[PDB]
Amino acid sequence: KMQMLEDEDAWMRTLHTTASNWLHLIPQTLSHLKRTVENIKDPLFRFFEREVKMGAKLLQDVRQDLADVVQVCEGKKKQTNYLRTLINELVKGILPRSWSHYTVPAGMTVIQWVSDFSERIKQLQNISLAAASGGAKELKNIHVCLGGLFVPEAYITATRQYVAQANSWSLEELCLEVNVTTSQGATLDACSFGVTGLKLQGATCNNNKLSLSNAISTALPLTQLRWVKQTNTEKKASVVTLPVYLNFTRADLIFTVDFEIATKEDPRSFYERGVAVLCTE
Amino acid sequence: RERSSFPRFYFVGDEDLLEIIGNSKNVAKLQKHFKKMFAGVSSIILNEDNSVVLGISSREGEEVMFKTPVSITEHPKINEWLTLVEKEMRVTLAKLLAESVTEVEIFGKATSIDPNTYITWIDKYQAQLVVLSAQIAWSENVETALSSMGGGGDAAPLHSVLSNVEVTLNVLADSVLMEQPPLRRRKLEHLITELVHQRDVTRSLIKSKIDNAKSFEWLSQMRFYFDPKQTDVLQQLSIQMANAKFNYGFEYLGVQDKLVQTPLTDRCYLTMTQALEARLGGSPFGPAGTGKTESVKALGHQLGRFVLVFNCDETFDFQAMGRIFVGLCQVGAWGCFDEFNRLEERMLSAVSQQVQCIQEALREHSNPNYDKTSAPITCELLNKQVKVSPDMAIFITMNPGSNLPDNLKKLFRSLAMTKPDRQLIAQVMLYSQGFRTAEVLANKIVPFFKLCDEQLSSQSHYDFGLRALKSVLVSAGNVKRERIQKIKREKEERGEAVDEGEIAENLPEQEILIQSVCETMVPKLVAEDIPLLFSLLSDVFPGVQYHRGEMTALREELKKVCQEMYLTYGDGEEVGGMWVEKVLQLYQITQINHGLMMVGPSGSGKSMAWRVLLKALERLEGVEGVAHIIDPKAISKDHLYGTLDPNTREWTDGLFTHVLRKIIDSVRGELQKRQWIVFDGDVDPEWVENLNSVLDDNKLLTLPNGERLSLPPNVRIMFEVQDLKYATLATVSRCGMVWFSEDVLSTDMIFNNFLARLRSIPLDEGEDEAQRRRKGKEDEGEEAASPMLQIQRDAATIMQPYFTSNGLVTKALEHAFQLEHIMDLTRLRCLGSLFSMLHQACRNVAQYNANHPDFPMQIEQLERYIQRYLVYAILWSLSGDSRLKMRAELGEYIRRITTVPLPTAPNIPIIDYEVSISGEWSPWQAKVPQIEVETHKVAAPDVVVPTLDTVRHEALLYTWLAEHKPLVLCGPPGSGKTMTLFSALRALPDMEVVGLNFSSATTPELLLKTFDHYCEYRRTPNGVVLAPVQLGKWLVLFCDEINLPDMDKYGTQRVISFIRQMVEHGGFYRTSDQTWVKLERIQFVGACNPPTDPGRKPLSHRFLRHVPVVYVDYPGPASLTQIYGTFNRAMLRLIPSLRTYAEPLTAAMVEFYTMSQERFTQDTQPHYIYSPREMTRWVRGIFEALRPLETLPVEGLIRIWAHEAL
Amino acid sequence: ANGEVPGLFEGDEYATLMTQCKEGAQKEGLMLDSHEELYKWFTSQVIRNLHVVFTMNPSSEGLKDRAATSPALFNRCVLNWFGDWSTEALYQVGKEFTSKMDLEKPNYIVPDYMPVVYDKLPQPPSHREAIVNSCVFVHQTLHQANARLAKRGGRTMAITPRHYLDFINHYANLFHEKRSEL
Amino acid sequence: LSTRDPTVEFPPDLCSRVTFVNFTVTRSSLQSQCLNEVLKAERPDVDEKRSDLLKLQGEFQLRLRQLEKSLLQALNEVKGRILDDDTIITTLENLKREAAEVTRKVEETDIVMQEVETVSQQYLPLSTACSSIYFTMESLKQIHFLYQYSLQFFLDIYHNVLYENPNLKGVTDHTQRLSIITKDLFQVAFNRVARGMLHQDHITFAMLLARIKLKGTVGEPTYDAEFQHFLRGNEIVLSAGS
């Protein structure tokens, strides 16, 4: 980012090429979820409909702005002063104020922003086509990446509501137990949901029991979040509470997990290790 | 000197201190400042001769007794007797607390305590002193417990203290199901709220197994070391928080809300009290709805210091912040600065500098080298010396969401307020109000509000914070007490034994809480969110149903008033169930709160719900209802809420202030009545700061003069606001909300109202029979009151199938919904235009049958004429705003979906056809006047050469001037709209025209000026009437450009709200006399461009709701050829040899003009626009060439023509 | 629109201007009695006598309240494209400003191809014709350089016939002071 | 008239009535100043040679003309007031020497300028290096808001490297002197710029100066494509599945 103040000793054509690449990589359309009165009783369907709506509206806005960029770069349209400032920001590598429509790491590159936008839009397309093919029932069965959702806090709330409706239980008698299974495609319980996209920090998982590691991070396999009835069970001394931050800067929290100390080590060692759970690196 | 003698004239203004010192005998004038002067003091108790201060009166009716009352006569110095009043107030607080702790020694040393003796103690002693005595008793018995332990490990005294607190709380839980006054009930609430916290402390100590007197496991809790034998009154009570050794400030708190000692507040008190011992400051940050400033308030209450939160959310006062600081330092006070980061740069840096100076001046006490034997503490507040008290504190609260100020990152020990224990707060409030199962229902209700704020669709009028939870729990406690009273009365009337505990055991608490939640929040919910929220609430509260509070009496009164007011009705879920539920919710909120918001958009029925509620309550309770629809944007701020003369002081009465003065005086005696004041039009936060004190707990109209106007429950201030998009959060939280969704004022509702009002309203009667509705009710024997009324009823019966649910009009309206018009579409506008057209159709039948006195027209002619007029009217009402292309396509859609016969010409637009006085069709071209203008003036036609468009437009201007409706004429500039307005308006002799153009900076001071010049004021027995000076002469005020005046700072323009109130009410509230008037002989009409054009502000739906709209396009080919053929035929008479060239001249001219306009369009260059104005400039040029010339050949004529074209 | 503005002449202004308008009416020689017809006569005199013309910048303004000035004004005002000076007008304004100086020297030779922008140049060119053609081509190349710089996206500005007249004055003045230096 | 900021947008109506006189320094202006202050301080013989051939204009013209007024013309009107000592031949030879001097300088007007041009051909990589150094060290603003510098400051860097450098004492050979000048320029610039930066950015600024010397040096490729792919490979599209 050094060379864009006075090192002028041709950005339109390069911006045209990268905008053509952006149009190539971003998917064209995001179809909205069809709403029925039977499906609207499912909070999973409610949350997924809201996310599909927000993602498709943002998709339409970004496709329209990209179309404006490519039409101006093709010599068919003209961009005004504020859009010239937008061009300056896109050249200099700063995400403008008209794109922070969800939760994202602060001060990151626009190309990676568009790349993870493409990934999450592909995830939304997958879940939308699964919903269209099967209904609200398959919304529980389909594994959903936690970090790729716009609001995974509302996702875990939605799974809470789904098990509450399924077992006709109040939302003060439910608690979350974390089951990181190395097995892929495990038989999901009616209270258990499949979540990928997690990665552990400062620790490694071994049969739902942590151990200290000198590595930077570990690749967490298919996680299962299970809502079991909160009994009055005494908490063990070998149980450790870890945050699940969304990103690396770790400014906002998603939810808390409970894992098990395996060997002699103090959970104070985990705490001073700063063992966290990240959704994005 | 005045500060040194009495430091309490300082938070209130210089004029206030001047009237205080000049009106020393005006105790009623002086008692106005106590509400903001003290923590909870409202006034003072004085003698009949005002010679002895008997006590102090609170806001909630508490009257504290004085064990040594002050006498004012022997101390004539004002500041001296005031200082003696507060000093003896401290002394009496200390002595009453001494007696109260003496008796609560026996209270706490007894295993069983008589509930009646307990209630007697509560009633005798004040709220502050009773909670302080509970504190002192518990802390002293646990001090005796620990000193008797002495390291021996004896758990018996701690167990006995815990059992004592448990049995006392059992007494509270058994006596809480009674009925009490508000003051005694609040004392009970505060006592149980603190005693459950002391229970928590004792459970914590017995779980920790502490056995030491000076152990920190006990030093980290709320300690009250009391010494009744102390000589000094302030040092009798000591509040010691770990290291800190403070003393309670014995000032009368009054009835102030006590906030619960949660662990977060416990850490907050820990940090701030340790900071104060260290002589630093405190500065908690965090988001909203967490408890920062009220936790500061709770600490200030529990220590006993004057807490006055200085909020500065765009409401700062830079000249008074320094006075705030000097007052804090001089008296000893705790000032929380809620949301300090929302301050602008220069004054933020200035106030940061002053607070830094104050913090360092406080820090001068921290070191031990600066001895307290000789301590002249000094500080600067804008070049002055101020001594800082050793007990004041400044708490600069921050609200990130930004960090601490640069000068304040080191002097203020900051704390993080992020997430309060809402489960704990719900549990303690349920247990304190009297709920037997507090914890389970609390832990159900706390995920509920976060769940709502997550799952519900985001809107501004929603709220789910902890203040909202507190108000919902207050409502739940009140409903629980009411249900207890009802069950007790029912068991008393029936034959059965009465036992409050037995009936409370078998009593549905989940039903009470779900009912209170629904009654507080459901009326603010849009119809989109209702079934999802019921499924949400059934998930959180399984098996718990919500029963609607049924009022069959008000249901019957509502049904009678609705049948009286030409409406429909429904008993729930029917056609009318939604509106009935909405108006009943309006009744519930008017009973609960003293003023609410109706926040439906335009076309909702909020005012009709309001009026039908007023009349139904009239017929129910016999309480006479008064309506004052004061419009806030109809007069400026000073005229609305009164103003002062800068010299020779006289309070001239504004509108709202005059209404409030009249109702407080109540010469007619309106306290027995029910007066309702409605602020129609949307909400603007520039006339709410005066309403805040009126609507708050003070209920006073504060004035600079000093006159206080109370608010009885006779006054209810409702609002009819279109949207709260520009409303403050204070107004969001203060008043209840009944959101009128647009799908409750249905098309069937609109149809039925039109049909019934037509069937039973006489049309030409006017002002005589409007006031004769008081005389008689039905007029039996007058079925044919007029032949036009027989026609109205017959036409309504004929058109009944066309105003159905799935009717032709409904389909046409929903198609015009998905069509496009330049102005902002409104369903009520389309329907109102259609109804006015049907009214004029009836008027046409009436005039035809009056001009045919031999016979009126038969049923067949009636049916054909009204059906054809109905198709004509729906076309001109729906597609009448749009351009010709989609106006024609809506004509085609009407043709393809209609059942009425239509003109047989396929390639001719249906809109180009006139309905005859007979039952058949006839084009306007058959009867267009083919005039021949004089050659004296042809290029500037003061009269229009008639064409298809001109005759259609003049006919419908007549139609919508007859019913005196306003009319707007939108379209591209130069389309002859002002000309057709002038021609059709001056053609009829019944009305005059006063042509006025609104500029961008117009105010209806101009309209009042033109009413003063062109009319006069006449007084009638029926009211006040504004009428033109010339008798029997209607006055149609004219508007060249309605769109042109600029919007206000919040997107609502005065000039259009004025005409809105004219067409809605029929009058305005005056400014000089502040009286209601009625427009008897006035109309309105205006012209516009489309709002996409640059200087054209789009109009409000509030005004566009009424006015019908017509699109004046460019005349088109046949119209242009006709009018300019007439122009040139009557123009070429200057030369007699060229009579046969006018038609080729016009044909060539208009063909060249049309092709030039089709080629050159404004999308390339902004100035490529063409209109018949330049065509008449062309004709003027040809005439100016041909006039001074005797003769000219055809070649010269074409040369002049082409020269002018070039 | 109406030869008048509703709101200018209300109050004592109405009385004073109506008495003066009646005085002018008897001065010119037509009889008017009623105030409405006198007001109409004053309106007719205004709509005959007064004409207002505009002097404003071309179609690049987007900042004033006018900015892209209202289509109502564009319709109600007769429009005339003042435009920019053409090469022929440039040749004339270059020819009859530099003729005062002693530019005459008959040793000039004509080439086989003479680069000329003023398409009706007198062939064979003289000293004056070559001078004026070069002066015009200087302005033409400044336009071309401005267009190139604006296409590349740099900071540009409009060049004017005022600039060109300044250039011609500069050339004649500089020739004058250098011949005066000799 | 004057202004302060260099980035304005004057309206066309004002623009027609006033012309612009720009003082701002761009790459060509900075390079011209660099040549100016390197051709007048480094080699004093080159300085005097360039100053000798640059004085054939109005200075020498007026110095000739002031007494050419009397020297040009001699025809008439004897008066007998010149043979006081017959020393006017020395008076006119005082200008004959100057006439011979200016004629010799007119005859020899290309060899000295050719030597100056061949010296300045070696100074072209130096001047483009100096320009890139200043433009990067002024473009330092995008790293941190404290990273703001002055063209006067850069001119002081250049002035100290040329004049007040003890490393230039007693050195005469010119290729070595050029290497000394460019190395000492880079050294003093890096030192005085990194006196006021964080440790996290000294490495960045050093890498930028090193890339500037790599692209301004001769005898080796500038590694432009390698540098560009190395740096901007993170910002260009990277294909998935590869």
Ligand SMILES: Nc1ncnc2c1ncn2[C@@H]1O[C@H](COP(=O)(O)OP(=O)(O)OP(=O)(O)O)[C@@H](O)[C@H]1O
């Ligand atoms: N009970 C009812 N049945 C049928 N129509 C009704 C009923 N109550 C109201 N309306 C309709 O409401 C229309 C006007 O109501 P109202 O003025 O209260 O609505 P609004 O658009 O919210 O206006 P505002 O807030 O300006 O008063 C009437 O013209 C009528 O057609």
Ligand SMILES: Nc1ncnc2c1ncn2[C@@H]1O[C@H](COP(=O)(O)OP(=O)(O)OP(=O)(O)O)[C@@H](O)[C@H]1O
């Ligand atoms: N169809 C028409 N017939 C006769 N005159 C016309 C017609 N259309 C335009 N004119 C001319 O238009 C001029 C007046 O314009 P118009 O009647 O549209 O009023 P306006 O006040 O200028 O309109 P706007 O609402 O655009 O401000 C007159 O000179 C009149 O001759």
Ligand SMILES: Nc1ncnc2c1ncn2[C@@H]1O[C@H](COP(=O)(O)OP(=O)(O)O)[C@@H](O)[C@H]1O
């Ligand atoms: N311990 C508590 N007991 C009762 N109410 C609380 C408690 N903590 C927070 N609240 C509620 O949270 C809200 C926070 O608002 P407030 O403290 O006035 O300003 P802020 O939102 O800036 O903290 C309060 O209105 C209060 O009713």
